[PDB]
């Protein structure tokens, strides 16, 4: 038998490789992960002797795997197999694809969208797509069309799901688009996923065993005997398949860029005190966090220092059950044209993950829970696809918040205050939990803030827009030769490529590492100075009381909760519980600066 080539493969496999397996034993889930480098450590570089006969001979590796299981566990014929190979070097691309790549073990990734649910599927092997329940006989001569139906009860089965996936974004060519590609996967991988991840799957492409075809007008024929003294056709299409997963890029025991292996509450959740606490409280670090992060960027430099906590966690305290509290906050930017709203807006996308750059002016209302479905695609109703909430505690910042229609209203008032999700179809009445905040991409009418009308009428749009969005922090243009020439003399070396930005002294990487250490305190606030934030807001209120004849505003307690989230996440930035009264002064200061953007 030729497939005793695969017998030798698994002979090879088992002997020298002879605990997660012991973990598998209760439901007999059969899944074990192994490196593919094993083929080089031990199979003596049989990668091309192994890779191609994957679904050829995997049955036989499966057999040997079960036969391994028998070598210590009392094994029975019930046993089945999965295999979960991994650590694939020289990862191939989506274009790495032909007829010729049958049976391979190529590695690929993407995202997870537009998915389908669990609907599962003689001790011989009748499990095929190329299957027939009616068969001829066993011992005697019986008919060739007749059939019994039998023990589907003392037997061995599986379970699976189905999806679609579009092409990756580290790979993005001209012209072409991220087309959709379709897979079923086995059970212990099932429903362990969600939209928005990165992978190194097994891409073992196989074909459709079709039932009928449309526009499949290639050879039309059949394995029909010759002549002497309705039929079927054949035209297929491609798919893919898999065996193994690793969701990547989204990690705190990881010791990151700026580390050495040290001790903590966990392994290296915050182990790097000895190096990072240099940059904990020494407010030169603040100046660095104003300056050593945007060396290529220059405008108003408050935005360079007010935004920063936005990336990082808020409150999430030990609180009531009656209603939700929030940690993170509504955000905006405005200014005028040619004040360079593109410098940072991509590095908004880049500086941290789940940092989704996508435009708003193109959207519909179906950029939240897509729409619905009314054919039996999966169960005639799968309407939990979306566009916004894919962030597992992540940001979805959008561009051009102006020409959009009046639908985002009901999306966003609830989004950053109520965090709920539903549609008006024949789905259900159910709702789920918003993870995300946003910032703006506004712009004025012609851009120019002619100080002759109210800001609300200088934009002239919906009403609560500027009450929910607690911080705007505008960048506005004037005509002063000094300010432009700071910029130009930064261009002096932005293309004189040697040190072609502002002098940096605090890397993005060490900074992004300290980010998570900020999130491991739970500051708890009964501060006397914090209790006097009532006095601060009242003293504020005399100033909200100001600008009330001319240009009264719509002020509320969202701003209050914002103020306290600000000081809270700042104490989280202090690397300290027991919030500091200095936060009172700072909060009051900048936020009573917020009024400067609206004076007329």
């Amino acid at each position: 038998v030729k497939d005793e080539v695969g017998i030798r493969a698994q002979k090879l496999f088992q002997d020298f490789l002879e605990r997660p397996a012991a973990s598998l034993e209760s439901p007999d889930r059969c899944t074990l992960e192994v490196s593919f480098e094993d083929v080089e450590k031990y199979d003596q570089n049989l990668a091309t002797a192994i890779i191609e006969e994957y679904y050829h001979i995997y049955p036989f590796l499966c057999q040997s795997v079960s036969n391994y299981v028998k070598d210590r566990i009392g094994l029975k014929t019930q046993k089945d197999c999965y295999v979960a190979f991994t650590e694939v070097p020289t990862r191939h691309k989506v274009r790495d694809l032909t007829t010729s790549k049958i049976g391979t073990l190529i590695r690929i990734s993407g995202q997870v969208v537009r998915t389908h649910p669990v609907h599962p599927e003689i001790r011989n092997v009748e499990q095929q797509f190329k299957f027939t329940n009616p068969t001829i006989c066993r011992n005697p001569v019986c008919s060739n069309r007749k059939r019994f139906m039998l023990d589907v009860e003392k037997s061995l089965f599986l379970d699976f799901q189905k999806i679609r996936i579009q092409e990756t974004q580290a790979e993005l060519p001209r012209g072409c688009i991220p087309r959709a590609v379709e897979i079923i996967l086995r059970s212990e991988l099932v429903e362990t996923v969600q939209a928005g991840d990165r992978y190194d799957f097994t891409g073992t492409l196989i074909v459709v065993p079709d039932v009928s075809v449309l526009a499949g007008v290639g050879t039309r024929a059949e394995n029909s005997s010759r002549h002497k003294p309705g039929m079927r056709e054949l035209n297929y299409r491609m798919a893919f398949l898999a065996c193994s997963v690793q969701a990547t890029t989204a990690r705190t025991d990881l010791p990151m860029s700026e580390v050495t292996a040290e001790d903590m509450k966990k392994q290296m959740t915050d182990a790097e005190w000895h190096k990072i606490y240099e940059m904990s409280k020494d407010r030169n670090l603040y100046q660095n966090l104003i300056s050593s992060l945007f060396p290529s960027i220059y405008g108003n430099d408050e935005v360079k220092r007010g935004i920063l906590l936005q990336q990082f966690g808020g409150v999430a305290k030990t609180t009531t059950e009656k209603t939700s509290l929030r940690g993170d906050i509504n955000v905006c930017i405005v200014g005028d044209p040619s004040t360079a709203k593109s410098q940072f807006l991509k590095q908004v996308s880049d500086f941290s993950p789940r940092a989704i750059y996508t435009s708003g002016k193109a959207s519909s209302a179906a950029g939240l829970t897509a729409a619905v479905v009314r054919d039996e695609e999966s169960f005639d109703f799968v309407i939990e696809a979306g566009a916004l909430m894919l962030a597992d505690n992540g940001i979805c910042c959008i561009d051009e918040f102006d020409k959009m229609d009046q639908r985002d209203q009901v999306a966003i008032h609830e989004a950053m205050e109520q965090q709920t999700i539903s549609i008006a179809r024949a789905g259900v009445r159910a709702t789920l939990n918003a993870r995300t905040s946003i910032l703006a991409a506004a712009n004025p009418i012609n851009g120019r803030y002619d100080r002759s009308k109210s800001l609300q009428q200088n934009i002239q749009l919906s009403a609560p827009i500027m009450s929910r969005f607690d911080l705007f922090f505008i960048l506005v243009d004037e005509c002063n030769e000094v300010v432009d020439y700071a910029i130009a003399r930064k261009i002096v070396d932005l293309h004189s490529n040697i040190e072609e930005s502002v002098e940096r002294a605090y890397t993005r990487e060490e900074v992004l590492r300290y980010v998570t250490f900020a999130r491991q305190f739970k500051p708890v606030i009964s501060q006397e100075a914090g209790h006097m934030l009532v006095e601060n807001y009242g003293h504020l209120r005399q100033r909200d009381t100001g600008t009330s004849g001319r240009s009264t505003w719509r002020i509320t307690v969202r701003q209050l909760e914002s103020m306290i989230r600000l000081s809270e996440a700042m104490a989280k930035l202090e690397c300290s519980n027991r919030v500091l009264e200095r936060h009172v002064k700072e909060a009051f200061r900048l936020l009573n600066k917020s009024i400067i953007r609206v004076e007329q």
């Binding site: 609907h119 797509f129 189905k162 429903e191 054919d375 939990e384 789920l432 009403a463 307690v557």
Partner: protein
């Protein structure tokens, strides 16, 4: 089989000899109870089965079907051996350990199972079969195989009608049936594992277990997992078309909107000795919504919308009205968020819907047969027999949705015209809404119909109100940041589970009717106000200005079980109207103050 020797003996050893609870075990009397009830649904608990023989758990689920048949036959052999009397005119039940949705799996087929779900829209009721009679074509003598036969063929040329009739005939007579209606499944929005795939699966019931289900309502089942008889078997596409079917043995309520306490009986007296007097406008009201400070107006307000619906047909005119109706105009910034939670748990009927983007257009009748994909859906109005539609952001809905709602308030019903079928839908229901205004967030004592723009023939049907203009009051805000911390410092009268006894009894017993007690006062509120409250904002007096008062002043007194009335509690409710009505009129408003402070 052999072992069934023992089983029947072991059954008969307990159904009338094994006893707990100080003798006369129910089973000895349950049989005759159901027998005299013509009911035929003997019930068991696995607990007592386990108390008898815990060996009854593992020779069972090799085939749980044999357990039930082996039990049904003990039944028959116990029924007519003792009651041969009523033998000319069975199935059983079990009802105790929970398993969860999406935990039944590949492995949980056709065994001892205990499982849950929820209802939605589905089909009607229909019959099925049990018995084999087909023959009469040659000789067609009486042959009579000896079983009612489910899926059984022999097909000889020899069969006792002169062992003939290889060809075939069919009967349409002497033919057993058994009614049956199909389900649709749903899963709870309380027990959510965060937005996973929405539950709906093929599940089944039977003849006696029939004609009881209702949409978006729940019933716990014993249940046992199987699959459709043939899920798309042919050499075919890249997947089998498989679903999987569950079938009902005992159906056990999950809702219990009726009496809920089975064999609480200790605390039941505190309701009618503390929610019965006219002080209960403070006792039952102190606990009205003690969550946050502001607006004790709404506490008194919402307490009485929950309360009624009634015939009390006046003289020979028609049915007049039996409904509640509320609406408010606020601003997000108001503490209006929690708009539907608790008294809908008090509500025996109601069903939720948030606002447009997710408002119901269903709020369309044909009649079909059922081939694959035959369904239709629309308005919940049969549901909500004295129930409520729980909503925020109402102002965007469709005029024709409002048509039904206006008709519900007008003729207690809706009126289809010019359709195929002209079926109806009776409206004994209640409504809640939370919209936003025009031109902003609230418009002052200037008119209210245009403060938020609903239309002419629609709002006149609506009843309750509460409106918040809100300027500053400081001590409560400092109290509220104290509330912020101490409410975020959950570091970790009428009894609470019995207040519903008040909706049971208060509305139930006392339903007073009266002559004109002083109601020519309302002739003044007609005529004087037609001359006093003339032109400021001052139309709104109608029959529903008092018919609504019957709706709710009666509720206010029905709280008390007065049974006979002077103007006291009536006008105490109109103390809402002195408060509710004033809100809609120009700052020349105190025409109400003058004209009612005696009615205050």
């Amino acid at each position: 089989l052999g072992p069934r020797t023992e089983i029947a003996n072991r059954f008969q050893s307990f159904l009338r000899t094994f006893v707990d609870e100080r003798g006369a075990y129910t089973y000895r009397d349950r049989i005759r109870r159901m027998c005299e009830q013509n009911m035929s649904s003997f019930v068991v608990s696995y607990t007592d089965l386990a108390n008898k023989e815990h060996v009854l758990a593992y020779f069972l689920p090799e085939a749980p079907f044999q357990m039930l048949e082996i039990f049904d036959k003990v039944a028959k052999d116990m029924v007519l051996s003792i009651f041969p009397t009523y033998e000319r005119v069975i199935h059983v039940r079990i009802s105790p350990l929970i398993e969860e949705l999406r935990t039944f799996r590949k492995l949980h087929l056709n065994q001892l199972v205990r499982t849950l779900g929820v209802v939605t829209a589905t089909t009607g009721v229909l019959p099925q079969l049990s018995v084999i009679k087909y023959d009469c074509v040659k000789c067609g003598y009486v042959l009579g195989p000896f079983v009612q036969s489910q899926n059984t063929e022999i097909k000889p040329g020899s069969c006792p009608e002169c062992q003939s009739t290889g060809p075939f005939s069919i009967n349409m007579e002497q033919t057993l049936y058994r009614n049956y209606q199909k389900i649709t499944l749903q899963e709870s929005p309380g027990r959510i594992p965060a937005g996973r795939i929405p539950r709906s699966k093929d599940v089944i019931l039977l003849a006696d277990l029939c004609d009881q289900c209702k949409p978006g309502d729940e019933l716990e089942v014993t249940g046992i997992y199987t699959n459709n008889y043939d899920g798309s078997l042919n050499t075919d596409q890249g997947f089998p078309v498989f679903a999987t079917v569950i079938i009902a043995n005992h159906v056990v309520v999950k809702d219990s909107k009726q009496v809920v306490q089975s064999l609480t009986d200790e605390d039941i007296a505190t309701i009618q000795k503390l929610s019965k007097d006219p002080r209960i406008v403070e006792r039952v009201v102190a606990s009205m919504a003690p969550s946050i400070y502001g607006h004790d107006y709404i506490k008194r307000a919402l307490a009485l919308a929950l309360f009624g619906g009634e015939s009390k047909n006046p003289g020979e005119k028609h049915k007049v009205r039996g409904d509640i109706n509320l609406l408010i105009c606020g601003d997000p910034g108001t503490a209006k968020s929690q708009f539907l939670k608790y008294t809908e748990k008090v509500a025996p009927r109601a069903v939720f819907t948030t606002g447009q983007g997710a408002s119901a257009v269903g709020l369309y009748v044909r009649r079909n047969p059922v081939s694959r994909e035959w369904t239709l859906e629309a308005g919940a109005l049969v549901l909500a027999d004295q129930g409520v539609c729980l909503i925020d952001e109402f102002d965007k809905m469709n005029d024709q949705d409002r048509t039904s709602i206006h008709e519900a308030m007008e003729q207690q019903s809706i009126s289809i015209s010019k359709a195929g079928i002209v079926t109806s839908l009776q409206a004994r229901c209640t409504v809640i809404a939370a919209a936003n205004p025009i031109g902003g967030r609230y418009d002052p004592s200037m008119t209210f119909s245009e403060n938020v723009n609903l239309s002419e023939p629609i709002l006149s049907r609506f009843d309750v109100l509460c409106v918040v203009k809100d300027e500053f009051d400081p001590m409560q805000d400092q109290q509220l940041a104290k509330f912020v911390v101490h409410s975020h410092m959950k570091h970790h009268e009428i009894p609470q589970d019995l207040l519903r006894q008040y909706i049971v009894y208060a509305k139930e017993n006392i339903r007073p009717k009266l002559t004109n007690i002083d109601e020519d006062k309302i002739a003044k509120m007609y005529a004087q106000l037609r001359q006093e409250s003339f032109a400021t904002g001052s139309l709104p007096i109608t029959v529903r200005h008092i018919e609504s008062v019957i709706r709710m002043s009666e509720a206010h007194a029905r709280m008390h079980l007065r049974e006979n009335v002077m103007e006291a509690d009536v006008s105490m409710a109109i103390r809402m109207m002195l408060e509710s009505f004033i809100e809609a009129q120009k700052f020349s408003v105190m025409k109400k103050m003058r004209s009612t402070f005696q009615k205050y």
